Copies of this chain bind each other. A is one copy, B any other.
Amino acid sequence: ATAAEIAALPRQKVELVDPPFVHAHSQVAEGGPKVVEFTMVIEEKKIVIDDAGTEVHAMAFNGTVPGPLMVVHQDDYLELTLINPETNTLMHNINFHAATGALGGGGLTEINPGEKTILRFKATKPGVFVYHCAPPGMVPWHVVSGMNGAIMVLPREGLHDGKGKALTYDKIYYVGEQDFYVPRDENGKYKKYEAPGDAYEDTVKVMRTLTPTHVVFNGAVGALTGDKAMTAAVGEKVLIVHSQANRDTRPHLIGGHGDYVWATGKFNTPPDVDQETWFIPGGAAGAAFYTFQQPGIYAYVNHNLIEAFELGAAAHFKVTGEWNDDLMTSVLAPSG
């Protein structure tokens, strides 16, 4: 497109919503390319990440960890207004793995506190992609401080299996997995700091051990458990988008499966099927499609079980409906 062609395209302002939920969107594109407008503010703030009051200075897109999922269609133009409040203390930018050029947009979006920038790029490749902050010289630090999220570039005609048949989801949830590296004093307790910059040196030391202290979904242990469990019903088709901007993960739905899984997160690559556990390398997003068949509670975990049940990477799905004794049945309940 020429400058004149792009400016003439229909435009749409989308109001982002907090994860695990996703803003309203149509799976199958209606009409020609559009310029889709998103606005995100950067918030540097303290968040508690576990039941023991552990705090961390998060650098979050729209104040959440992970940042919100943005959805557009292949060949749409994503036009983002990124604002860095005069209230913040660090420079930030954004790098879309979905984009082409200038370090994913990082080289054109360096904004200091009190500045804003508007970046536009054409979403040429379909799939789910990671996006994260990446300021020269401080890349890992901003990412493992929670400054990352994902976008989804849906094919114009919606999703399809390898065979080429349509896959329509009833619900979609976005699970952002985050590895945190919280420094511990000489006595084992987690340290606290006044400002982000004060925790840098100590945090880098933990990072170099490549061993995270916490691995959580939606920014905190238990964030998606109990009453904040994701929901579904027997018969419902669910797309679960999962991202990890820095470290490997291996999602597993306990009691379920990944009927169709784009483990690489790219829609032009046929999905693997009937997966028990899939693998998403650090720096990538993936997606799993599943149709619930049994009611009850399910757990959704990173299957290095130590990371899931000790470090925090576990979420719940509460599913309603009728039990199917054909798929599974207790012939003899536990008995003497």
Chain B: CB-nearest residue to A124: B327
Q: Of A106, A112, A211, A272, which is in contact with the most chain B CB atoms at under 10 Å from its CB?
A: A272
Interface residue range, chain A: 35 or more
Rounded to whole Å, the gap between the CB of A110 and the closest CB of chain B is 6
Question: Is A107 in contact with chain B by the CB < 8 A criterion?
Answer: yes
**Interface stretch of the complex, out of A11-19, A50-58, A61-69, A137-145:** A137-145
**Interface stretch of the complex, out of A165-173, A194-202, A217-225, A243-251:** A243-251
Of the residues B3, B109, B250, contact of A334 by C-beta under 8 Å? B109
Of the residues B103, B117, B254, B279, contact of A95 by C-beta under 8 Å? B254
Interface string of A18-40 (1 = CB under 8 A from B): 00000000000000000000000
Give A219-255 interface residues, CB cut-off 8 Å to B: 245-248, 250, 252, 254-255
Of the residues B99, B101, B120, B211, contact of A331 by C-beta under 8 Å? B120
Give A165-222 interface residues, CB cut-off 8 Å to B: 204, 207-211
Of the residues B143, B266, B294, contact of A101 by C-beta under 8 Å? B294
Contact between B117 and A330 (Cβ–Cβ < 8 Å)?
yes
Of the residues B79, B140, B303, contact of A309 by C-beta under 8 Å? B140
Contact between A303 and B281 (Cβ–Cβ < 8 Å)?
yes
Question: Is A156 in contact with chain B by the CB < 8 A criterion?
Answer: no
Contacts of A293 in B (CB 8 A): 100-101
Contacts A100-B294, A274-B269, A310-B208 given; does A332 touch B122 at CB 8 Å: no
Rounded to whole Å, the gap between the CB of A269 and the closest CB of chain B is 5
Question: Is A104 in contact with chain B by the CB < 8 A criterion?
Answer: yes
Give A102-156 interface residues, CB cut-off 8 Å to B: 102-112, 114-122, 124-127, 129-130, 134, 139-140, 143-144
Question: Is A89 in contact with chain B by the CB < 8 A criterion?
Answer: no
| Chain multiplicity (copies) | 3
Contacts of A250 in B (CB 8 A): 248, 281-284
Contacts A100-B255, A101-B323, A307-B210 given; does A335 touch B115 at CB 8 Å: yes
Question: Is A275 in contact with chain B by the CB < 8 A criterion?
Answer: yes
- CA distance in complex: A267, B276 (Å): 12
Contact between B101 and A328 (Cβ–Cβ < 8 Å)?
yes
Interface string of A62-98 (1 = CB under 8 A from B): 0000000000000000010100000000000001011
Q: Of A116, A296, A307, which is in contact with the most chain B CB atoms at under 10 Å from its CB?
A: A307
Contact sample, A vs B, 26 pairs, CB 8 Å cutoff: A81-B332, A97-B252, A97-B276, A101-B255, A101-B294, A101-B328, A110-B334, A117-B330, A117-B332, A119-B328, A119-B331, A121-B329, A125-B257, A130-B277, A139-B308, A140-B308, A140-B310, A208-B306, A248-B248, A248-B279, A266-B272, A266-B273, A266-B275, A266-B276, A277-B281, A284-B303
